[PDB]
Design a protein around this ligand. Sequence first.
Ligand code: HAS
Ligand code: HEM
Ligand SMILES: CCCCCCCC/C=C/CCCCCCCC(=O)OC[C@H](O)CO
Ligand SMILES: CCCCCCCC/C=C\CCCCCCCC(=O)OC[C@H](O)CO
Ligand SMILES: CCCCCCCC/C=C\CCCCCCCC(=O)OC[C@H](O)CO
Ligand SMILES: CCCCCCCC/C=C\CCCCCCCC(=O)OC[C@H](O)CO
Ligand SMILES: CCCCCCCC/C=C\CCCCCCCC(=O)OC[C@H](O)CO
Ligand SMILES: CCCCCCCC/C=C\CCCCCCCC(=O)OC[C@H](O)CO
Ligand SMILES: CCCCCCCC/C=C\CCCCCCCC(=O)OC[C@H](O)CO
Ligand SMILES: CCCCCCCC/C=C\CCCCCCCC(=O)OC[C@H](O)CO
Ligand code: CUA
Ligand SMILES: [Cu+2]
Lengths: 166, 31, 535
Amino acid sequence: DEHKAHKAILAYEKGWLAFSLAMLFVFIALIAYTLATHTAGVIPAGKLERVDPTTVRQEGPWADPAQAVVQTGPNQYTVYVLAFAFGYQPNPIEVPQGAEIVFKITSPDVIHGFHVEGTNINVEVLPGEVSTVRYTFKRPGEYRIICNQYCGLGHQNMFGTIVVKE
Amino acid sequence: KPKGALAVILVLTLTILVFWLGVYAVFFARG
Amino acid sequence: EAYPEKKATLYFLVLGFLALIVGSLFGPFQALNYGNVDAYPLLKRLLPFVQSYYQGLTLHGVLNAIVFTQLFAQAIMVYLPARELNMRPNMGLMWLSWWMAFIGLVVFALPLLANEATVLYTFYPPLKGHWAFYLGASVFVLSTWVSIYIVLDLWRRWKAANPGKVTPLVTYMAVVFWLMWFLASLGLVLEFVLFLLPWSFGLVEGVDPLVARTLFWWTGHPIVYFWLLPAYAIIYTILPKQAGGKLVSDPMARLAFLLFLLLSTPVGFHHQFADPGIDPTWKMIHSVLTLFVAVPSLMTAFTVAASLEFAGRLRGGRGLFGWIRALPWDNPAFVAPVLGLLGFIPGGAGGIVNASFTLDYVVHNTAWVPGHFHLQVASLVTLTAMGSLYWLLPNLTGKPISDAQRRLGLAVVWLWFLGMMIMAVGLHWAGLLNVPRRAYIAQVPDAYPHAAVPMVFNVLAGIVLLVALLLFIYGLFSVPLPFAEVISGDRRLVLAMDRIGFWFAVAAILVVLAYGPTLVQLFGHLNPVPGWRLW
Ligand code: HAS
Ligand code: HEM
Ligand SMILES: CCCCCCCC/C=C/CCCCCCCC(=O)OC[C@H](O)CO
Ligand SMILES: CCCCCCCC/C=C\CCCCCCCC(=O)OC[C@H](O)CO
Ligand SMILES: CCCCCCCC/C=C\CCCCCCCC(=O)OC[C@H](O)CO
Ligand SMILES: CCCCCCCC/C=C\CCCCCCCC(=O)OC[C@H](O)CO
Ligand SMILES: CCCCCCCC/C=C\CCCCCCCC(=O)OC[C@H](O)CO
Ligand SMILES: CCCCCCCC/C=C\CCCCCCCC(=O)OC[C@H](O)CO
Ligand SMILES: CCCCCCCC/C=C\CCCCCCCC(=O)OC[C@H](O)CO
Ligand SMILES: CCCCCCCC/C=C\CCCCCCCC(=O)OC[C@H](O)CO
Ligand code: CUA
Ligand SMILES: [Cu+2]
């Protein structure tokens, strides 16, 4: 009885472990795929870029919000975003649709989310690092920026805005 | 044969699959 | 006298459930908040030291996710092996370990209760809390190092007496588990030692937020497996008796556990998928190894389902589903872990979503995450702890559980389980609506209107769990270990898995290989930045 059940349970567990493992592999293959598309742009560049959080509001690309949007290609724009307590400059960020947007976001105080609602933009912002991400907005309109990394008592009311023009 | 255990891991696979394919889908929608 | 290990083990349980009660008080308030309802005026009247939602949230996570969990882990994963070996722990160390825990707890609790350390249970720099938080917490966590020694002592002493014997199952679980925990703990010890302590004492002016995050999540994942594996130990070696059956495979159990020693630690970057400065190839690698570490639980699901089925067919249940009803749904020690096991299905599921590199950008730092992990720690671990109260409290105190007390226990378990299911729905759903975690949203009520429906779920969960908690306080204040047999049918696997030093080495090498290259680059380019107090 028991020696038959321990045999059968185990013979079937073995199939299950094979199967689950393959599903896991398929997932891995599917994740690989995303890595090869443009949708992979939202993965932060691997890339250390230090900056001084004490001077970033006072010298450099972050120090004149109104010129933070800079054509860097024929169809690419770099945007220098400051994420601070409690908010984002510029407000708003204006970019052309269909243009590839390189966001270069840092913080002058604490860590901040940059989760662009309705998109896959969702990056952490660490003081003294520049986070780099890419998106091409595909519909024009207002997108809301949320902060999803607790940063003090103003956390719940820290939003920003990206306006995509046609 | 352990039909009961097999059921459980069946519900599991499906739950996993819905979750995972569910969010793969949302990902491409938002990308 | 003959088991003063009971007295210590007990002290551990009581303090953790102490921590759980106090922690959970903030729970229903945070649930109503995620149902767009601000009840905090009410809270700030009962507990007028509470100055913010975020201070309550710290208390909650720290007391529930670190304090309860660990104390429970120390209770179970010291005592159980000792009883299996019928041997005595070093009671000098076992009391040292408890005191470091108690004294460390008090020492960080002070700033917490004083709005001096309202960082979360993650304390990410530059957010800067009181020195006593980092000191306090330091001592608390190192209390488990002592525990690690205790059990390796026990094991070695036993292996002295019994060479050419393989390690016995529970103790083999306990050893691979404490070995895993030491390895895993280093990142955070490193973080405290090189960074957090010097910083809060004023010795250094900055910490590098990226490097602190990285050293943190080195520890920050395996800590959850260190929460999980006491409940696993019980689900494996006690539960199958509670249900009326047996463990279907001893090696299968060891294998799961061994896989956890190898794979719990080298995975941390899946908390850092949205971090800058970490290299995407290294993020893919960790993604791969994190899909791998979900394997011992895929395995566990089967071994355990099989064991329950075996129980319910022994107990005369016939069908595809006969076996389920034939089980002891009158025994809260059976019911509670089985319910957690259920909610772990979707919990594991969401866990596997979070681990895919690019899928994380959908859900990262939304309400999805807390949804995922309440299923895992707040339910499956906690319910396992809760229901064990019904065999463990007798075994430690000699006090019986009445019928009435048994019934009250079933109710709580069920209320708590259902609450958790409901909140889990509300939270996953809000997360998919891009509702963020760690947010006092009731305070911006017109902000997430697309989330009305999952908000109803969250309110309901709020009062369901409030009542659950209220009952559990009332019940707890009102109040041979049932090891299962293994079933009859490899000595080759079992012997190889017992080369424990060997496996420990591999686990150590894998960390070096998974974290080394990236931490070297990090330490060559530190950018410490000033602390802030924004609460
Ligand atoms: C003790 C608690 C924890 C467990 C266990 C746990 C499991 C997993 N997690 Fe997780 N999770 C992640 C990946 C997973 C994966 C791959 C697993 C795996 O271990 C899951 C494997 C499990 C399964 C595949 C399911 C097995 C099911 C079973 C065993 C059911 C058996 C059924 C039976 C026998 C019932 C029979 C009954 C009948 C009678 C029918 C990732 C990402 O890669 C993140 C980061 C997300 C982000 O963006 O920040 C994360 C974040 C969290 C957070 C938030 C941390 C924070 O504050 O920032 C915490 C607290 C947490 C806890 C825990 N986590 N997790
Ligand atoms: C009465 C039961 C409880 C309720 C209703 C409940 C509710 C809550 C809510 C609504 C959140 C999300 C708050 C936010 O993201 O801002 C939260 C946070 C949290 N929960 Fe609980 N929960 C309870 C019990 C537990 C238990 C038992 C655990 C530990 C085993 C736990 C661990 C956590 C942790 C770690 C966090 C995240 C803290 C952070 O992000 O810093 N909860 N819970
Ligand atoms: C026993 C454990 C679980 C207990 C069972 C759950 C009890 C929930 C009650 C449901 C009845 C519905 C009553 C709803 C009526 C009041 C709603 C209300 O007044 O709304 C709040 C308002 O919008 C803010 O200002
Ligand atoms: C899109 C993909 C669809 C997924 C939908 C669910 C997939 C099935 C789930 C689990 C199967 C696990 C069972 C595998 C068991 C193999 C049978 C076996 O090993 O049988 C041994 C026996 O001795 C005979 O000789
Ligand atoms: C049993 C025999 C073994 C057979 C088992 C094979 C399992 C196949 C699973 C996935 C294939 C991957 C296909 C990847 C295509 C993904 C494309 C997609 O979904 O994205 C489109 C979007 O428009 C882009 O931007
Ligand atoms: C039990 C749980 C059931 C839960 C049910 C799941 C609900 C998922 C909803 C949306 C997924 C995708 C959301 C992404 C929204 C895309 C909208 C968009 O692309 O545009 C917004 C922008 O602001 C235009 O100007
Ligand atoms: C028992 C406790 C329950 C556990 C918690 C369950 C709550 C969420 C469940 C499944 C999420 C599945 C993924 C959700 C995404 C599916 C929506 C979809 O199909 O969206 C595609 C569309 O293109 C996008 O805008
Ligand atoms: C046995 C214990 C639990 C085990 C199993 C529990 C897992 C539940 C799985 C899916 C729930 C959600 C259903 C899937 C959601 C449907 C998609 C949807 O709602 O559509 C989105 C659309 O964009 C609208 O806005
Ligand atoms: C919002 C989400 C809420 C949905 C939450 C539901 C999730 C699963 C519920 C119950 C699982 C119980 C399954 C097994 C049933 C146990 C009771 C039983 O089988 O009764 C036997 C009888 O007592 C003779 O002994
Ligand atoms: C008798 C034991 C079980 C009974 C359990 C009842 C069934 C669960 C369904 C709803 C309860 C939730 C009621 C939540 C309280 C009011 C909801 C709310 O706050 O709604 C906001 C609304 O969308 C804008 O004002
Ligand atoms: Cu900025 Cu939260
Ligand atoms: Cu993790």
